[PDB]
Amino acid sequence: MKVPTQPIPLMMNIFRDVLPTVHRYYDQWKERAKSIPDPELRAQALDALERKEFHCEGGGIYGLLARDRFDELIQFIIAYQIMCDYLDNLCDQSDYLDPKDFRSLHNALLAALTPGEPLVNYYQYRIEQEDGGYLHELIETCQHILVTFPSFRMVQENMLELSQLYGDLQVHKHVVKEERIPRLEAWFNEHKEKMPEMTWFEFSACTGSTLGVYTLATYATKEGLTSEQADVIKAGYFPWVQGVHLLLDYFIDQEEDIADDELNFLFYYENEEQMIERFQYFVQKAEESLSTLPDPKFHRHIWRGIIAIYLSDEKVQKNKELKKKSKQMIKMGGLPSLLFYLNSWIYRR
Template sequence: MKVPTTPWTLMYRIYRNALPNAHFYLEYWKNKANEIPNKELREQALSSIKDKAFHCEGGAVYGLLAGEDSKKIIQFIVAYQTISDYLDNLCDRSTSLDEEDFRALHESMFHALTPGAMPINYYRYRSDQNDGGYLTELVQTCQSVLESLSGFISVQEAMKKLAQYYCDLQVYKHVEKDQRVNLLQSWYERNKYDLPDMTWYEFSACAGSTLGIFCFAAYASNGLMDEEQVKLIKEGYFPWVQGLHILLDYFIDQEEDRIEEDLNFIFYYENEDRMVERMKHVKQKAEESIRNLPNWKFHRLINKGLIAIYLADEKVQAQKEIKRLAKRFIRFGGLPTVFFYLNSWVYRRA
């Protein structure tokens, strides 16, 4: 199947292929989550699927890069994103603030990218234990799909590097509140020489996305890649596209995070004008970074669609100041973003 490169062909393929397959696999994992024996783990697994299904829906778009392997790639994306969202709940809304516990949980995300790795007890540092094999099956599903991809071996290390950024972020941002900023700033200091000019909180945002991992999986279905191709894809997504993704996520969560006293990277901008200026900069750099990618017009649409998907969220409509700023961000994306915004708005309310 041809990779879509216009807004209308992309939307058609999303509704025709990506979303139905994503919902098929989400329903499977929802049924599995319902069977988890431990009450706390069951509630967190079900909550992550109920509240964050749109992460899987958005990620499934990358299946459109995989031609005949589209459904297989979406199976991986849904399983991997479900691990991510489930662990986020366990770290964010559950019973532990222990760094060792968070590290152990996130070993599952590395095992998922390592076919042949034997699952272990990822819950070994917490009291809630029995998930009935739920997390192990998610890991093994990812392993099975990746093992079948002809080009996986050439992208595995790059995928693990992005996973390392992601997992480090999840650990540091969920420990005791008085330790979080210091840990994140120290982490940034260790990595800043490999980064373009950005703040510690912008780097943290760039680390918090799984989009680069999904992109690699999709291209791995098309055959082996050389080092230069792998580098182009990695630099195409990290840091700027991933940063745009997560900054938008934090942008719409501001009110909720204030109430819950959660870490939100948007709060660290000096003022509103600086935040808007930097968001525009990240968006522009994201558009530049994808120019050297294969199917770059598809990736450009993803950038514009990201803005629309987040700004069409009901949270935006409920926050007067956020809604006002959202209109400025929509204008950044031009007519394709307006098109995706209207589609997203109707879809979510339907």
């Protein structure tokens, strides 16, 4: 009955059930994306699918908490995540940089979390519009599944709040370079009163994960969730757990971003020791919020799994300075290094 929380059965279920199920649906979307009529939209859809499998693989692990709705929960997670990464590509690769385009696109995520929302032309503010129904199909996939979850209505408000903040982030960060930080700071000002003490760039990190959305959807599959329980679940992931994941994402990409002078949120810390100190703080708060969740051991394994996977990257492990700093940031009993050497072996064979 209970979700596996020992490493052997947990890992076994991930490789037997989660990964093949994720890829069954992922591969179906790959085939649909090839049919996209507009060659630019088609290229951006396929590129996102080629490069961002891991996000769906990680998200699908939450299916183990809801075995009775395993396939449909994974279908939701995968559709929503595919959307996120497709829209990330569309905004990141736009030649035009209209925030109205970015906003319109990210309103698709709100529609996905709103059964009965009329589907509109999300591409109305850009030149490329013929996707053969790809984005609509992704939205509808989510809508059709979520409405059948017996506690969806109880988590829906919390899911939309997280989705809205994520959307805001993608609008502001992709505009012409000179307008990005001013937009992000003014946006943080709208929400600063209601958040714990943090900077605009820490807040930006907290909003950029989809883990909260998937966790809420997962507990939506169970009968009789209360409003207080839905708020506990949201708080378990937001802001601190989501923040750690995005701070790590930006940590790994520092060398690439400093080469191209791309927006990296970690650059706005006063110095490296402040960055490290605040990361440690974030880790402590995230540990704390995870402990408040149902199935606390499971959520801890997932969270620390994703951290070990990110830190196992060649960009950390082969960089003497980044490896040093990463071990000060979080202690993982040598797991990131072990995963790096294991992956090196698997590549060779």
